[PDB]
Amino acid sequence: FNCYFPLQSYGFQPTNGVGYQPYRVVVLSFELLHAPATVCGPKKSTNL
Amino acid sequence: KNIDGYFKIYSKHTPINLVRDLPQGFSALEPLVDLPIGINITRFQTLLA
Amino acid sequence: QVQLVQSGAEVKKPGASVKVSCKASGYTFTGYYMHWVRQAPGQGLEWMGWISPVSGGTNYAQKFQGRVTMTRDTSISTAYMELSRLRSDDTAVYYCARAPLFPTGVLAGDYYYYGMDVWGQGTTVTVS
Amino acid sequence: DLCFTNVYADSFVIRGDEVRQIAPGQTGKIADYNYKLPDDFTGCVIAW
Amino acid sequence: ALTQPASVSGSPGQSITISCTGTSSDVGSYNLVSWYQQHPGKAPKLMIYEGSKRPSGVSNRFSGSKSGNTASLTISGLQAEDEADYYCCSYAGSSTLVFGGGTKLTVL
């Protein structure tokens, strides 16, 4: 009593609702301090 | 050396035949590595096998 | 302190017209497009149209295009909605409604977002 | 075309019933106990 | 234009969900779904707006979720005062943002 598991498992099945389906989420967070930047968009080049 | 946080490494290798001291001569060092570390470094140490 | 008052109950004959007023205070009147909703007794809501108190812009539902007409008076901060060619199924409760934000939402979405302030009541009954 | 110092990929799986909570200023089970986002968050969220 | 259950029942303390299914052109292409609560004979009150954002003063027990073509209202810790009709709202292509059947929430 009073002592419930902190995490709950998902009933993930292919027949459940689309709102009950597992969704894969990736969050891309940016950061730019006074240190030089190293994650660049390279360039779009033209013919010479 | 460190220039505005950029760690620049120059290097040059050459074959010599001398064990007492440094051979006298001239040799240019080409730029090899320029790493943007942005770390304030004031000391260093070498590693030997 | 946003205050909203409508006209009283009204009864009309089939084929006539009905004119309801919508008088607001406590906020910038022209800074909020006024939406309108109707609800039959015991039924759901039915949105009808919206009016822009600035420049007089208006747009109605395709369900009511041609029968409903809006005007507004900014001198007294009031809206006015008229239903023409009334029939039996127009007996219902009618409100105006104030939209949530200010029309400075560069990307917000106004005035298509929603309604935070709903008005008291205007009941129009149409029976022979 | 822009360049940032670092980017961070935060990869996870969520329930459908929590999906809108991947955003600044959200609450719920996941948004409050599983994945909280900064108020000054800079980045982009992708999901499928 | 939207479809939601007519009446669903729950227990106190329960977390309850209310579904509302649209199409890919109104709910599936816009993150502009909402939930309104109205008590009997009362004025409706906007509980959830712009997906899951809440107006000031609304309790945190009401949250929202969106999946494909489905909107979902979530209520954590059901109480007796939660008994009312709930409507889902979404832009549909014209004028404009109407409710639905009226999910009547009852407590056992």
Q: Which residues of D touch A30 (CB under 8 A)?
A: 4, 6-7, 42-43
CB A25 within 8 A of CB D45: yes
Measured from the Cβ of residue C34, the count of other Cβ atoms closer than 10 Å reads: 25
- Number of domains composing chain C: 1
Which two three-digit tokens encode residue D41? 């968050």
Instruction: Give the residue from A7, E51, A29, A11 showing the smallest Cα distance to D15.
Output: A11
Solved with: cryo-EM
**Topology of the domain comprising E7-107:** Immunoglobulin-like (2.60.40)
In units of Å, what resolution does this entry have? 3.9
E63 touches chain D (CB under 8 A): yes
DSSP output for E43-64: --EEEEBTTTB--TT--TTEEE
Residue D33 backbone dihedrals phi, psi, to 5 degrees: -115, -20
Q: Which residues of B touch A32 (CB under 8 A)?
A: none
E93 touches chain C (CB under 8 A): no
For tokens 């199409």, name the residue. Answer: E23
Q: Annotate chain C with three-state secondary structure.
A: CCEEEECCCEEECCCCCEEEEEEEECCCCCCCCEEEEEECCCCCEEEEEEECCCCCCEEECCCCCCCEEEEEECCCCEEEEEECCCCHHHCEEEEEEECCCCCCCCCCCCCCCCCCEECCCEEEEECC
D20 touches chain E (CB under 8 A): yes
Q: Which residues of E touch C116 (CB under 8 A)?
A: 46, 55
The CATH code of the domain that includes C60 is 2.60.40.10
Q: Where are the domains of chain E?
A: 7-107
Distance of alpha carbon E78 from the chain centroid: 15
Distance CA(D31)–CA(D41), nearest Å, equals: 14
Q: How far is A38 from chain B (nearest CA, A)?
A: 8
Q: State which residues form the domain around C34.
A: 3-126
For tokens 């991947």, name the residue. Answer: D22
Secondary structure letter of residue A15 according to DSSP: T
Measured from the Cβ of residue D47, the count of other Cβ atoms closer than 10 Å reads: 13
Q: How many residues does chain A have?
A: 48
Q: Which residues of A touch D45 (CB under 8 A)?
A: 25-28
Residue C55 backbone dihedrals phi, psi, to 5 degrees: 65, 0
The residues, ordered by sequence, that sit 6+ positions from D15 with a Cβ below 8 Å of its Cβ are A10, A20, A22, A23, D30
- With touching defined as 3 or more inter-chain CB pairs under 8 Å, the answer for chains B and E is no
CB E32 within 8 A of CB E51: yes
Distance CA(D1)–CA(A42), nearest Å, equals: 7
